[PDB]
Homo-oligomer: A and B are copies of this chain.
C-alpha cells in the first residue's frame, strides 16, 4: 500500500489542475459513454423529463502517466477533485445534481499510459419540446445535449465510444413509465458556433410513444357513454315534453360536466388536441340530440307527422353518424 502512496504523491506533486492536458500541443479528445439507470417522469405540461444516468468520460493526460506493478489505480473522488477533469455541462438542462451518498459518486481510474476514466451518477431534468397535436396518440423526442462550457473546438473535442462500449445503454427496470413507452435511443455529434468560440455538443435523443390506456379510461369511454345517453331520448315519448326536455338538458349538463373534468388533466397548450376534437364532437352529438327534440316539439302542433319521422329517423341516423365518426377518428390518429 505504501508503494501506491508515493505514486499518487509523485503524480500530484507539482500537478497544475488549472491547466488542461496537452495545452498548446493537442486537442483533448474525450470519449463519452452513458448508462441510463432510470428514465424519470416525463411532463407534457412543463415540457421536460428527468433521467438518471451513469455518465462516463475517458481522455488522454500525459502528466498522470506512471509505471508500476499494478496496471490500474482504483481511486475515489478524493483524487478526482485533485486532478483536472472536463467541465462538461448539459446545454438544455434545467437543473441537475450528482448523487452524494455515501460519498460523491465519482469514480477515477488511472492507467499506466495516462488513460483516465471519470464517471459519475447524475439525475438531470432537461428540456423536451412537444407538438401535442396528436395527443394522446402522440410521439415525442426528448434530446439530451452536453458539451464543454469553457473549451471551444480548438481546445477540446467530444466523441462517442465506438464499438467496445455501447454509446447509450438503458435499463429495462427504470425505463418503465406510466404514460409513455421508450421506443429507442439515438446519439449524434454536432458543432455549434457561439460568441465565445465554436463548441462541439453531443446529443442523445430518447424517442417516446404515448400510452393511451389511461385516457381511454378517463375521457374517451365516459364521453362515448354520454352521447349514447343523449340518444336514448329518441325512444321515449315525444308528447311528454317534460320527460324529453329534462332528459335533453340534463345530458348536456352531464357532457358539460364531463368536459370540464377532462380539461384539468390535459396539457395546457394553446392549440387543438386530438382529444379536444373528440370531446368537441361528442358535445355536438349531445347538443344535437337536444336540438333534435326542440325541432320535434316545434313541429308537433301543426306537423306531427313530420315530427314523428324526424324522431324515428334520428334513431338510426344519430348512432350511424357517431359510429362512423369513431371509425374515422381512430383510423386517422392510430396511423
Chain A residues with a Cβ under 8 A of chain B: 1, 3-5, 8, 14, 16-25, 33, 35, 37-38, 40-41, 45-47, 52, 55-56, 63, 69-70, 74-79, 85-103, 105-109, 117, 119-124, 127, 129, 149-151, 155, 164-166, 169, 173-174, 176, 178-179, 194-196, 211-214, 217-218, 221-222, 225-226, 229, 232, 235-237, 240-247, 249-254, 256-261, 263-264, 267-272, 276, 280, 283, 287, 290-291, 294-295, 297-298, 300
Contact = CB atoms under 8 A, between A and B. Distances in A.
A276 B217 contact: yes
B103 A52 contact: no
Copies of chain A in the complex: 5
Contacts of A79: 18
Contacts of A241: 236-237, 240, 242-243
Contacts of A225: 256, 283, 287
A272 B257 CA distance: 23
22 contacts: A18-B76, A19-B75, A38-B94, A38-B127, A74-B151, A85-B102, A93-B101, A96-B100, A97-B101, A106-B149, A107-B196, A127-B173, A164-B195, A169-B195, A178-B269, A214-B268, A225-B283, A229-B249, A237-B241, A243-B245, A250-B250, A253-B253
